[PDB]
Design a protein around this ligand. Sequence first.
Ligand code: AXC
Ligand code: MG
Ligand code: ZN
Length: 314
Amino acid sequence: WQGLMQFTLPVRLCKEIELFHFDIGPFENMWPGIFVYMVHRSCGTSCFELEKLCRFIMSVKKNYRRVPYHNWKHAVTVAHCMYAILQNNHTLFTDLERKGLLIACLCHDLDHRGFSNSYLQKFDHPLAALYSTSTMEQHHFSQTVSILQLEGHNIFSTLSSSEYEQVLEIIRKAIIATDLALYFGNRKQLEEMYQTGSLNLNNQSHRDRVIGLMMTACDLCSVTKLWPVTKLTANDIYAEFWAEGDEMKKLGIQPIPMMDRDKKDEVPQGQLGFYNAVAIPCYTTLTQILPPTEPLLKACRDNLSQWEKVIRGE
Ligand SMILES: Cc1nc2c3ccccc3nc(SCc3nc4ccccc4[nH]3)n2n1
Ligand SMILES: [Mg+2]
Ligand SMILES: [Zn+2]
């Protein structure tokens, strides 16, 4: 972290980091510094102790595993998308929420092992015994708290108890909301609330639901990057799906299709289903509630039609 304290973002990145489509991929060595930058620009220079923050960042980094998709790179990619969301909707959120949500995005897949929640449930993994729903997402939070409580890592030490436990709740909720199994209910409710005009960000329950959708929107943002970056990040995703499907084949169990590397002809069609069923819906409702996030929906549509071109060989 010594080098991270005296790190500085190049003036070129200062312009582009603000854009939704910005792709962090090409700047691996700057990722921790990019996150520090984003926290300062959104939450200020004065709230986090530079040293404790930098140490926390590198311990978060160290506790992400080298797996195809749910890795350090993905953590920072999800943090960035949130930054741009926060930056375009700044005063709709409180200072404590932005503190908690940026950290939550960075920490939201800590210690991911490359296995889904169903895998862990089906094979009675210890973690499935402690956590019976949103198994990994509950582990990811518990992992966040564990780092926070390390010597010198408590970046929320300068908060009151009330505020500390407030930001842990923003965080816990936000990390749990990245369990995609919860998203579908969340989105349909948010859609109904918006369509009836009942939605109210001063209503806490509503407010938690918007934040949840923001986290989903952030988790999936590889579908809002430029086509070639999107393509590339799809390799990473299915690489991890197939790795897991393989582990089932070793146990003589045919995996679901998206985790079966012998069924990869079905990928183009699988992406079509995912954009129609999951991704487009997400950014559509998000754009209704936070209009300045439309470019996410715009880029998502662009990429859907790209997967449409592929299906008919073009
Ligand atoms: C680019 C991408 N990102 C994801 C993803 C991200 C988080 C959780 C699941 C994800 N699944 C996929 S593709 C497999 C899939 N196809 C579906 C169709 C309908 C509903 C869920 C689906 N998941 N993809 N594809
Ligand atoms: Mg996750
Ligand atoms: Zn994630």
